[PDB]
Write a protein that binds this ligand. Structure first.
Ligand SMILES: *C(=O)CCCCCCCCCCCCC
Lengths: 6, 161
């Protein structure tokens, strides 16, 4: 999910 | 009103909405790198550098055992204590597994790097097959806490077809 934030 | 870790640790399904707004990221946590690699082979599976993501993987992904996630992020003006993520993966709203990663303390205006490890839950040949055959019904919620208070929420879905 952290990939959403880039 | 303030969502804590014990709240999300009981979640029975993927949330129907986001549990916070973008403005609740008062710490200005900003991810600048995200990388996952297979721990068996050492292969990079996905890297992104500098609130919803869709991934498209292959069936072989579902045979991995362990995957390493490296993250780099910056923080703004306030110190950040007990930064933590709880990320919950479901298939058709059945929990596959919940991961709980601690990042620690970050001083203001810092960039920080951590690597954590995902250990796959056990998956049965039936389950895998269903997962391959139903793309994007595998979903995840990523819940980010500073000092036990929810500050970000990211969603994802996955295809293995
Ligand atoms: C999204 O941005 C985080 C994506 C991380 C994907 C790899 C995590 C390991 C897969 C979870 C195990 C459950 C699926 C079988």
């Amino acid at each position: 999910g952290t990939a959403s934030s880039l | 009103q303030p969502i804590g870790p014990e709240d999300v640790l009981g979640l029975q399904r993927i949330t129907g909405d986001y549990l916070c707004s973008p403005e609740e990221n008062i710490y200005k946590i900003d991810f600048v790198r995200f990388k996952i690699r297979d721990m068996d082979s050492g292969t990079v599976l996905f890297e992104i550098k500098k609130r919803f993501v869709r991934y498209q993987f292959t069936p072989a992904f579902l045979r991995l055992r362990q995957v390493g996630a490296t993250v780099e992020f910056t923080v703004g003006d306030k110190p950040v204590n007990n930064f933590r993520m709880i990320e919950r993966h479901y298939f058709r709203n059945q929990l596959l597994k919940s991961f709980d990663f601690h990042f620690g303390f970050c001083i203001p205006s810092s960039k920080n790097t951590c690597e954590h490890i995902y250990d796959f839950p056990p998956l049965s040949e039936e389950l895998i097959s269903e997962m391959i055959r139903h793309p994007y019904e595998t979903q995840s919620d990523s819940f980010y806490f500073v000092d036990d208070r929810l500050v970000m929420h990211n969603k994802a879905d996955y295809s293995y077809s």
